[PDB]
């Protein structure tokens, strides 16, 4: 806190509580007793505990019938109207799409749809496999996830 | 039917004005003016001008007489105090309050 180390008034005789610093946390405009510093909130997650967690999540998605498996998932051109139409035909609104090769057209076509997300098999995260109502994985994706989890 | 006149931020402590305000509470306007006219207090001048304003308001705005009117409600609220420094002995300072009052006078026939 900006200010001098000057003792505001003499230790004894004034009849006021003894003061040492105008920066005392007891004082208005004073320091914060336990001032925060920038922190790293990151936690270590054991590799096996991460993979075992994904296995648990993907296994739940099957039993709750939230995992949909398709041979191929793509659109004609990078048009949001095309994907939007394909999702009201396949009968789901909020959905997470995992595909083998990150097709530029499908990525661009799902970018302005907030309820829809498009990623690769290597880009799956635990929160996104729970957050989204449904998860639509291509046949190639299941043959990339297995080999990545084992 | 009630008519209100206020002197807000009047230069006098609420204590001093209240002495004069207790003389005319519940009296007839004619009986109140006389009383204030021969009350030797600065506050008597202040409160007389509010009562006269109250009567004028009751004659012009809320079509009424000057015979039937009585001082139905009178009260004085503490206004904002002005803080001044008074130098005392041995370079010590006191903080003088110049107290102000809000003087409200209500007149009515009922």
């Amino acid at each position: 806190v900006t200010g001098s180390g000057k003792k505001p008034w003499r230790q004894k005789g004034t009849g006021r509580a003894r003061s040492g610093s105008i920066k005392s946390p007891i004082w208005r405009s004073g320091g914060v007793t336990f001032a925060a510093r920038p922190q790293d909130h990151s936690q270590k997650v054991n590799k096996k505990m991460y993979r075992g967690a994904l296995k648990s999540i993907l296994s739940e998605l099957v039993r709750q019938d939230r995992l949909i498996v398709v041979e191929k998932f793509s659109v004609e051109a990078p048009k949001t109207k095309l994907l939007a139409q394909k999702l009201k035909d396949m009968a789901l609104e909020d959905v997470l799409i995992i595909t083998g090769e990150l097709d530029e057209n499908l990525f661009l076509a799902a970018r302005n749809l907030h309820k829809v997300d498009v990623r690769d098999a290597t880009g799956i995260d635990p929160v996104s496999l729970i957050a989204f109502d449904k998860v639509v994985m291509t046949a190639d994706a299941v043959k990339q996830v297995e080999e990545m989890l084992a | 039917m009630e008519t209100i006149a206020k002197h807000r931020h009047a230069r006098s402590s609420a204590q001093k004005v209240r002495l004069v305000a207790d003389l005319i509470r519940g009296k007839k306007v004619s009986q109140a003016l006389d009383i204030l006219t021969y009350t030797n207090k600065k506050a008597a001048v202040l409160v007389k001008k509010v009562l006269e304003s109250a009567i004028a308001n009751a004659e012009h705005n809320d079509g009424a007489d000057i015979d039937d009117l009585k001082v139905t409600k009178i009260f004085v609220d503490e206004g904002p105090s002005m803080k001044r420094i008074m130098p005392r002995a041995k370079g010590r300072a006191d903080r003088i309050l110049k107290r102000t009052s809000h003087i409200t006078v209500v007149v009515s026939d009922r």
Partner: peptide, 19 residues
């Protein structure tokens, strides 16, 4: 709040000495 206290000023009487 409270104003900054004054530096020492002249005192009228000596503190009694008890000894």
């Amino acid at each position: 709040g409270k104003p900054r206290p004054y530096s020492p000023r002249p005192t009228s009487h000596p503190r009694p000495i008890r000894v």
